[PDB]
Design a protein around this nucleic acid. Structure first.
Lengths: 106, 109, 171, 136, 197
RNA sequence: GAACUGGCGAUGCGGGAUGAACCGAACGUAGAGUUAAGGUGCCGGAAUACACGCUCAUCAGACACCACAAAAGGUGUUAGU
RNA sequence: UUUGCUCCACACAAUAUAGAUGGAUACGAAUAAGGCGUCCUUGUGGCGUCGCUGAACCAUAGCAGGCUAGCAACGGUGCACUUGGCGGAAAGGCCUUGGGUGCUUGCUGGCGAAUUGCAAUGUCAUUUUGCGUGGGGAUAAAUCAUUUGUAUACGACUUAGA
């Protein structure tokens, strides 16, 4: 067809933070479509990929991926907490990111 | 090894006899009967990769005949069950993709 | 909180000079048993020469509403402490049960006189069994024959941050 | 000539007015207003749909255009009897509001094979409608 | 959900719209706000004129050129109210603010596009009926904006052209609705009705 | 200038924008969970939550320590005797 | 100034991305009112219907979407042209005429796909520049130095000089 998307779009909002101290080890993700923790409970444990590009070709590609997963819900509005192998570079606040449907329970 | 044996059928969408992981599929509610297929031939030793040595490096750049007539035996038994209810051949030939406005936490498969 | 009504019956501790004290009973609106017994001992220390160390509580029982689906008019007599003095007030509330009536009473006093729970004393609450004994206009307004009114200016709260048409406030 | 005003009627709240519970434990059933507590809340009862007789804030219900006869303060046996006599449940079901609700829940209850089927049928219907869009 | 969101600023409250839009930019949504002369501020016109005069008094004493700049256009007033809610002195704030452009009227890039509203910042949905409000164009031309009438003339011309568009669109959609109704009650129509479409 | 206690001095951490003393809590290096005091329009992590009222200020008001306001008045408005 | 400059087509390199992954899908006004349809005496008109959110509408099947056969219609859509308009607020876009060409999943068939081995973004976008081709297009000024004095601390300014 014309669409081939097998993931859900999301936005990298910020790190986990207090009013004046942030914590880069936990990122905050807005998954689009979900507006409550009860709907966000479907997406727990799903893999997340941040997909970006670079000028230098490394192993056949100019596209590099950072992997992570959803761990828990955050707040009352469907924001989730996500942890990555290496933390997200904080210039990606507001950048798009992919939530895959695996590991599936359905 | 906790894997699922699946087939396309190969005549429909070109997916051969294969094994997949159960955590990487979505079980839809659409059900066909697979009684009449003799799948006890296949096992974990049926799929062997014949592991490659470290010396054989592919600088620049086939199929088992046993595998291809096994596929031809099973898929002709599946498609007879496919022909009963309408539009299943078209459904299995078409691909799945998420459109704009599809919420997977609300979708039923 | 969301109030409940309890009867609390207590007495003095029995002595040899006087066994069987007189078993006083009071009706308390409170959130739970602990607050109910505390308010019971508060009002008995205001009334008689007794305190909690010198007395005991023989019974506490929740009194729920006899007809929780009948719409009543209640007259409520209240003491409250203002910033300069102590005053008595009589307010009447049209509502379906006694605990909800005193909940709206506590909200009404806190809203209109800035009176707190520690300042309000509930003298009594009683159902007005007959109309035309209702003396306040704001509740006598709702007792007319074939009462009907519209609700102008409907505002519907949205789930999305963006709406794709100009909304209507018709009801 | 004659004097003309725009009437601008809307959906009075009184006894016998049928309402739809918007949010709460019922959340989508019908009830009948039994009496009016004050400006902001009313005593309702929904005895056919299983809504218990209760006082409720007017912001938690939506008023429907349906009305039927009740005396004020009627108990639930009389409410159910007059509801069945006026037969307002299928009168609600005949409205386009309830048809919209039923369409929404049907589209929610569709599966992937049914979504494929409606895509094929919509393509066929679009073919015949755009063929009709060539003669006028 | 959208590449660019075009917001019709008419009938909106300035602070509530700015707090919606600033969060949208910080989340990464591109926003363009049109018709900035029709924003509303709650309160009397005289109160908001006094507020702007209190703001207009404030300037650097030894050199007025480096002081706070008092911008007079309605779009720049909205930009001031939004820059107050974005942390504009950082690179993240600058990257957010470059996703925004605010206009008086609807310019020709956006007059053929779709305009949306924000229902939690609309005046008719937020204010009690009876409270007084202002129009940002009237306040701005009271405090020194020079281009209130040319925007009105351009908006009149644009509305004439848009009504000419809408008449043709309405005629076409009535033809399409007529053909859909006549091509309904066939077998595919009843199967789609059973399946929910 | 004294009395009893707790502190700062000698002490970082979360909150009070900011601050020696206030509130919370005292500190090896890390991970996960839960909270205190304080907050949840945006800056800013978190409900433009729910519920009942009150107030429209041609100097509104917005939180302890704390960064001020009184006597006297007002058919402004609300509730009472 | 030893063949330089610009534009057009693709050919290869480099360069990055504040962050495509079906579609930014166009009345205006009011909200104690409207929208749409229809009728008439065309109005601040009569009658009917709708809202109660975009949970919509359009699009959406095919090797990341192939190679072929037929049926039914004379539709739908893409590409390069082509005719006629309209658009100056930041127009740089919108509509339309005609023919060509490709596809059509509206309907019915035939062949292909495996081995990426049980997942690894599994690579499909647009931004700038350079160097090659081969096809057009055009053949300047400014500054220093000299001079002026309507100018001037110096710069700067205003003048003149084939």
């Amino acid at each position: 067809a014309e669409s081939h998307r097998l993931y859900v779009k999301g936005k990298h909002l910020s790190y986990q933070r207090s009013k004046r101290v942030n914590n880069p080890n936990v990122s905050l993700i807005k998954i689009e479509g979900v507006a409550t923790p009860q709907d966000a409970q479907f997406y727990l444990g799903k893999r997340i990929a941040y997909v970006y590009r670079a000028s230098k070709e490394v192993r056949g590609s100019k596209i590099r991926v950072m992997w992570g997963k959803v761990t828990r819900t955050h707040g009352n509005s469907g924001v989730v907490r996500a942890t990555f192998r290496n933390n997200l570079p904080a210039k990606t606040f507001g950048a798009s990111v992919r939530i895959f449907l695996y590991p599936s329970n359905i | 090894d906790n894997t699922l044996l699946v087939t396309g059928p190969f005549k429909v969408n070109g997916v051969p006899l294969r094994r997949v992981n159960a955590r990487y599929v979505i079980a839809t509610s659409t059900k066909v009967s697979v009684e009449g297929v003799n799948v006890e031939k296949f096992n974990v030793e049926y799929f062997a990769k014949e592991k490659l040595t470290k010396k054989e490096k592919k600088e620049a750049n086939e199929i088992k005949t046993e595998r291809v007539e096994d596929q031809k035996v099973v898929d002709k038994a599946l498609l007879a069950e496919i022909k009963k209810t309408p539009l299943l051949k078209q459904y299995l030939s078409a691909s799945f993709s998420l459109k704009n406005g599809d919420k997977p936490h609300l979708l039923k498969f | 909180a969301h109030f409940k009504e309890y009867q609390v019956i207590g007495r003095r501790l029995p002595t040899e000079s006087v066994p069987e004290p007189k078993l006083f009973r009071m009706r308390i609106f409170a959130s739970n048993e602990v607050i109910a017994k505390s308010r019971y001992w508060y009002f008995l220390q205001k009334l008689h020469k007794v305190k909690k160390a010198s007395g005991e509580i023989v019974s506490i029982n929740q009194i729920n509403e006899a007809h929780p689906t009948k719409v009543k008019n209640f007259g409520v007599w209240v003491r409250y402490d203002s910033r300069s003095g102590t005053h008595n007030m009589y307010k009447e509330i049209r509502d379906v049960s006694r605990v909800a009536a005193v909940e709206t009473l506590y909200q009404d006093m806190a809203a209109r006189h800035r009176a707190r729970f520690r300042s309000i004393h509930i003298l009594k609450v009683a159902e007005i069994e007959k109309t035309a004994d209702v003396k306040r206009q704001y509740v006598k307004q709702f007792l007319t024959k074939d009462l009907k009114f519209p609700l102008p200016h409907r505002v519907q709260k949205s789930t999305k941050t963006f709406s794709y048409k100009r909304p209507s406030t018709f009801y | 000539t004659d004097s003309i005003v725009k009437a601008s009627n809307w959906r009075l709240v009184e006894v016998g007015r049928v309402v739809l519970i918007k949010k709460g434990q019922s959340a989508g059933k019908l009830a009948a207003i039994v009496e009016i507590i004050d400006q902001k809340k009313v005593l309702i009862d929904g005895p056919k749909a299983g809504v218990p007789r209760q006082a409720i804030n007017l912001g938690q219900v939506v008023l429907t255009p349906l009305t039927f006869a009740l005396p004020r303060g009627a108990r639930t046996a009389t409410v159910s009897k007059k509801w069945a006599a006026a037969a307002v449940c299928e009168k609600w079901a005949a409205s386009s509001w309830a048809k919209k609700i039923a369409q929404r829940e049907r589209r929610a209850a569709l599966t992937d094979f049914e979504r494929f089927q409606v895509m094929v049928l919509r393509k066929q219907k679009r073919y015949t409608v755009k063929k009709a869009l060539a003669k006028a | 959900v959208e590449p660019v969101v075009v917001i019709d600023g008419k009938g909106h409250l300035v602070g509530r719209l700015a707090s919606v839009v600033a969060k949208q930019l910080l989340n990464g949504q591109k926003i363009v706000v049109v018709r900035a002369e029709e924003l509303n501020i709650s309160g009397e016109f005289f109160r908001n004129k006094l507020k702007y005069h209190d703001f207009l008094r404030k300037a650097t004493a030894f050199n007025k050129t480096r002081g706070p700049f008092h911008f007079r256009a309605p779009s720049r007033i909205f930009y001031k109210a939004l820059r107050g809610m974005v942390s504009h002195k950082t690179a993240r704030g600058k990257a957010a603010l470059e996703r925004l452009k605010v206009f008086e009227g609807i310019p020709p890039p956006y007059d053929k596009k779709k305009r949306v509203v924000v229902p939690q910042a609309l005046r008719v949905l937020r204010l009690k009926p009876g409270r007084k409000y202002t129009t940002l164009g009237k306040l701005s031309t009271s405090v020194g904006w020079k281009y209130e009438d040319v925007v009105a003339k351009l908006e009149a011309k644009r509305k004439v052209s848009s009504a000419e568009y809408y008449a043709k669109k309405r005629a076409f959609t009535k033809k399409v609705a007529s053909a859909n109704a006549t091509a309904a009650e066939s077998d595919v129509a009843k199967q789609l009705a059973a399946l929910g479409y």
